[PDB]
Design a protein around this ligand. Sequence first.
Ligand SMILES: *[C@@H]1O[C@H](CO)[C@@H](O)[C@H](O)[C@H]1NC(C)=O
Ligand SMILES: [Ca+2]
Ligand SMILES: [Ca+2]
Length: 272
Amino acid sequence: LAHSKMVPIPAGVFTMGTDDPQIKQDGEAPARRVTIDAFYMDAYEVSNTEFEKFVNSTGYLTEAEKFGDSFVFEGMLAPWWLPVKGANWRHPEGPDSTILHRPDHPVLHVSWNDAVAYCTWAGKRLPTEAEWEYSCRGGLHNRLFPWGNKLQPKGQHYANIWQGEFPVTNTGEDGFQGTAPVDAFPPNGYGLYNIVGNAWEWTSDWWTVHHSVEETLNPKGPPSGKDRVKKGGSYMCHRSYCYRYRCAARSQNTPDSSASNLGFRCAADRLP
Ligand SMILES: *[C@@H]1O[C@H](CO)[C@@H](O)[C@H](O)[C@H]1NC(C)=O
Ligand SMILES: [Ca+2]
Ligand SMILES: [Ca+2]
């Protein structure tokens, strides 16, 4: 295992967003050309084991632990999100759940602040939304998914999302009802794993839905806001109610929020 390994994301210009938005309320549009300097991205979502090395070193107590509750999806105990007392990264469905059998799965119940603490501890940082989307797209232009426009290319599952009738029945057809190991599923063109699906991923940007079509260079998002941007979708997503396992998709939460489907990966200017 090399679950803290990074890959070099090459310098380039890409189209961020889409002029064919699918969730218009989320500011997926307009498409805009964005220039990104070469940098490094974690190949994997930060795992339980890797987060435990952080906590072992620093003694860090996560915001969910201090608050004393976190949001858990009802189907694994909106109306299907329940604030559960004693749910946190070590007990992802509440006090009598454990991570001992899933050490290689993504860490969950981590806030934006928790993520920044981890990444900075590791000599890294969160990616910006633009870096994240560029990396997600994996060197392809204007495609829905890291791998192209088909959800199941060659009849193969390429990401851990939902199959079945949400929220009642997850068939587990793709091989995972909850999370999968951080190295599950094929990599995209840049060597990134589970950049769509599995856990949602925090980014550094303040959220807004108002974007210019101006061209930009290493954009950081707006200078203020109340919610931070998260990307990529999770194991809960299904086309029927969600459609957020697209690189262009985007959503938000307050920086002190935490949930059973939300995690992160780090980036860095140079190798730490
Ligand atoms: C964290 O520390 C505990 C107790 O010393 C140890 O048993 C465990 O293996 C450590 N975890 C990691 C991921 O290094
Ligand atoms: Ca699944
Ligand atoms: Ca993910």
